[PDB]
Paper text:
All MORCs share three features: an N-terminal gyrase, heat shock protein 90, histidine kinase and MutL (GHKL) ATPase domain, a central CW-type zinc finger (CW) domain, and a divergent C-terminal domain (CTD) with predicted coiled coils (CCs). MORC2 possesses multiple DNA-binding sites that undergo structural rearrangement upon DNA binding. Importantly, MORC2 mediates chromatin remodelling via ATP hydrolysis-dependent DNA compaction in vitro, regulated by the phosphorylation state of its CTD.
To determine how phosphorylation of MORC2 affects DNA binding, we purified a MORC2 phosphodead (MORC2PD) mutant comprising S725A, S730A, S739A, S743A, S777A and S779A mutations. Interestingly, almost all CC1 was missing in the DNA-bound cryoEM structures indicating high flexibility of this region upon DNA binding. MORC2 constructs containing either phosphorylated or non-phosphorylated CTDs did not induce large structural changes in the ATPase domain upon DNA binding, revealing that the ATPase core is highly stable in the presence of AMP-PNP. The observed flexibility of CC1 inferred from its absence in the DNA-bound MORC2 cryoEM structures and crosslinking mass spectrometry, suggests that CC1 may aid in binding and compacting DNA. The ability of MORC2 to bind DNA through its multiple sites, combined with the flexibility of its CTD relative to the ATPase domain, explains why it is hard to determine DNA-bound MORC2 structures.
Numbering used by the authors:
A (entry chain A): 5 to 290, 365 to 514, 519 to 551
B (entry chain B): 1 to 290, 365 to 510, 519 to 528, 534 to 551
Write the structure that this text describes.
């Protein structure tokens, strides 16, 4: 019996400490997006409710239709390190039992989480404002639960429930049980979770770091856009478009669907490479698919995109010839999905915990990328002439090519444009040319007579496998 | 300032797996080690000894021991160690590196499965035992941490609960490298002064091949990363001796690795034609309502070891960061080492203290540094000489850039005439410049220990 022994405890300042892991704020947001995906949500809505009385002038809301959380799961949310997703063969991104807390405390001072399950709706309130105002060094988290049908309290302690609800009304954007019930009603199905981050972090100028004004359809970083800054790093729409290698959950930003894209599908001459990783085999004792392709659309947006369990960890990583001053292998996008048995993510899921094995994987990627360069033989065809074939005659490299319809279609018909249905969530390849943000497309709108119906099996692209060496 | 009682409300809690979660912040293992080195420095230690005690029965084959002569810890501070986020150092105008109340735990759990910390203060000897082995063996999901205290003089237990003390000591004897109170007191006696702390990380993480990540065999004087060092690998990233040599911009604590002193070096003190630059940051001015010194110089000794070294509160956060012309294709500003000490009011470190929490303001600082580095290049005006000719004057006549310069005594002395070799006394910790060593050196071996530390004030350049 170890009841009398000391326990490691969380202090209020540890919320900020944990939040410090996210120097990439879109990574903090991706924590909540990953949680929604793990919850089997078919849909996550990322929108802002204007609130001029709250720091930043608006709340950041993550509404998903996933499995939600019963009171036990909601309580486990504040068990740092607790992750039921940490399971063998798990396809769930979450493993560290930390992402929600770290990301939410990076995004804003306070977050209030509304979750609904079979017949229970639970509110989880993490208010650093409450802690600072009332001088609390622990991390006290109200966790009231109502019956999702009767809306009556579900508690073994009416005193505790009253204190929790009064704290919510005092320190949250919602001053009454009626406003709280409105938030719950925003969860339309039998299950789902709404995470509202409010009192958002301000920059030096007093403006919120998240800019939702420049583009009402996007969550942007409040900061200038250098010529080399990447859309996935300045635009959360662009980030969420590639956040997952297997996009199944629909992402909506300010009510506008994010056009998720598989980076492999948008490349010229893709060649998959089966790398028999000694790391993977050693931890099996206890293969990887490198997909390389030329980004004719944006030769600037080249680099390795390393996913870990379908979730983007590294983006625009330069490997192999991309590291040298010569542009050889320039414009090539590499994508690899690394399972947990090969690599684990860092604390913020923006890097890999095992630096040595990540370096080994990057070296393997560089070797296979050089092999891909030799295989496609566009150097044998002439690299600059190949680029000119798609309108890249500008002396500069990064900025896009001449957008005249000639080269536009030359690139388009070399890129099989795929789309996802808004109802069955399956991905289809279209035989025509799209006109333009995404639509509410469904399988019924596919002119392809072979797959024009909803029940049609997903015709899966099979990248032509290449052999290393 | 609470309106009511919150005893019944749920508290966020640490689970056993959160130890690993926290440890995952350190993809850089030497950063995990630097957490303990920073703690020793914050404890005002004059020296920290980083040595390996061979233990074939423990995973990795040896224990990693951090022995410092700092202020140590009374039982209250030792208890506060496991209060995640608790940092008494997090105070206004604090020179102490620690602010997040996390470094020890994150770094120790990154380095090894278990760590046992022995700390001594006025008359108390406290042991803090963080044993993930114990938790795994006994199915503990919380983080239970034994924290027995002995009277440093009588060696008697200091506890308000003899049952708790007995359980803590039995857990230590069962799951730690030290199976008896005699061995525990032997560890305590390794703290020779009235105060100090000994942190022993054991059951070290193994690589895939079953070897420990920390290689203490290739170089018995160094703690190395167990891995091949490609041409571009940096010594500070593969050698912990090299890392600790530059871990702090103000080296005052002596660092010994395997009993061998680390020759700490101020990167700004060994550059050719250094020019400090006064940069005023609106963030600094604001949070003062609540200047930065960019030092640029040419690394003639190793022009390949060039880049910005960003220190935060005297502690290295970013190393070899490329800014300004260093990012383009060409050797303009090549070989330039830039050093800046950013106070906490200007930037805060990330969770692992290997990056800066405010990415936007870090980018602003890097842009300012690049502008000032271009200014430095125009100021020294190597066009007077030509970049290649200037490099050749110091032995860089090889067509390649990365490879070191000529070892001929001519060029060696040519370089030495530009970099006044500075030395730190082993008795008073003061730094002296000699006109013209591994074991030790004092002011008498030049001057005396009572002489004021002459400061090498860099010339001041002008930006625009
Ligand atoms: N949107 C959500 N829907 C359902 N359950 C959720 C949601 N967000 C969080 N949870 C639950 O709360 C737990 C804690 O979240 P989090 O702190 O992100 O840990 P994790 O997701 O398990 N692991 P990681 O994200 O790698 O730290 C999750 O593991 C889920 O059980
Ligand atoms: N070697 C040491 N000597 C004395 N006190 C120490 C030592 N190591 C740790 N401590 C104490 O234990 C506390 C917790 O250590 P740590 O987890 O490193 O947090 P911190 O050093 O306060 N801040 P950070 O390193 O930024 O997380 C310190 O703040 C000190 O009070
Ligand atoms: Mg998560
Ligand atoms: Mg510390
Ligand atoms: Zn369909
Ligand atoms: Zn002296």
């Amino acid at each position: 019996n170890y009841s009398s022994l000391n326990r490691a405890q969380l202090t209020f300042e540890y919320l900020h400490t944990n939040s410090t892991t996210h120097e990439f704020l879109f990574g903090a947001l991706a924590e909540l997006v990953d949680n929604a995906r793990d919850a089997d949500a078919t849909r996550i809505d990322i929108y802002a409710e204007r609130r001029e009385d709250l720091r930043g002038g608006f709340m950041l809301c993550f509404l998903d239709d996933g499995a939600g959380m019963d009171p036990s799961d909601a309580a486990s949310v504040i068990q740092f390190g607790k992750s039921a997703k940490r399971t063998p063969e798990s396809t769930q991104i979450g493993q560290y039992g930390n992402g929600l807390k770290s990301g939410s405390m990076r995004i804003g001072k306070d977050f209030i989480l509304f979750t609904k399950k079979e017949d229970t709706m639970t509110c989880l309130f993490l208010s650093r404002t409450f802690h600072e105002e009332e001088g609390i060094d622990e991390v006290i988290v109200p966790l009231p639960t109502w019956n999702a049908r009767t809306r009556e309290p579900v508690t073994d302690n009416v005193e505790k429930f009253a204190i929790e609800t009064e704290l919510i009304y005092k320190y949250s954007p919602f001053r009454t049980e009626e406003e709280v019930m409105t938030q719950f009603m925003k969860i339309p199905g039998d299950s789902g979770t709404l995470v509202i981050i409010f009192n958002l972090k301000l920059m030096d100028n007093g403006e919120p770091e998240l800019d939702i004004i420049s583009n009402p359809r996007d969550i942007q970083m409040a900061e200038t856009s250098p010529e080399g800054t990447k859309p996935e790093r300045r635009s959360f729409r662009a980030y969420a478009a590639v956040l997952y290698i297997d996009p199944r959950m629909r992402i909506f930003i300010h009510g506008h669907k994010v056009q998720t894209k598989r980076l492999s599908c948008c490349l010229y001459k893709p060649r998959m490479y089966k790398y028999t990783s000694s790391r993977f085999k050693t931890r099996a004792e206890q293969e990887l698919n490198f997909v390389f392709g030329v980004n004719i659309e944006h030769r600037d947006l080249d680099g390795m995109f390393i996913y870990n369990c379908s979730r983007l960890i590294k983006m625009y990583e330069k490997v192999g010839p991309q590291l040298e001053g010569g542009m050889a292998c320039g414009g090539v996008v590499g994508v690899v999905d690394v399972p947990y048995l090969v690599l684990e993510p860092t604390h913020n899921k923006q890097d890999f915990a095992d630096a040595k094995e990540y370096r080994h994987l990057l070296r393997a990627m560089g070797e296979h990328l050089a092999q891909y360069w030799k295989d496609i033989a566009i150097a044998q065809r002439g690299i600059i002439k190949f680029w000119d074939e798609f309108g890249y005659l500008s002396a500069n490299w990064n900025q896009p090519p001449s957008s005249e319809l000639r080269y536009k279609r030359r690139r388009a018909m070399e890129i099989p444009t795929t789309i996802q249905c808004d109802l069955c969530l399956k991905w289809r390849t279209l035989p025509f040319q799209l006109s333009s943000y995404p639509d509410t497309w469904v399988c019924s709108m596919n002119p392809d007579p072979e797959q024009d119906r909803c029940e049609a099996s997903e015709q899966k692209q099979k990248v032509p496998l290449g052999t290393f060496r």
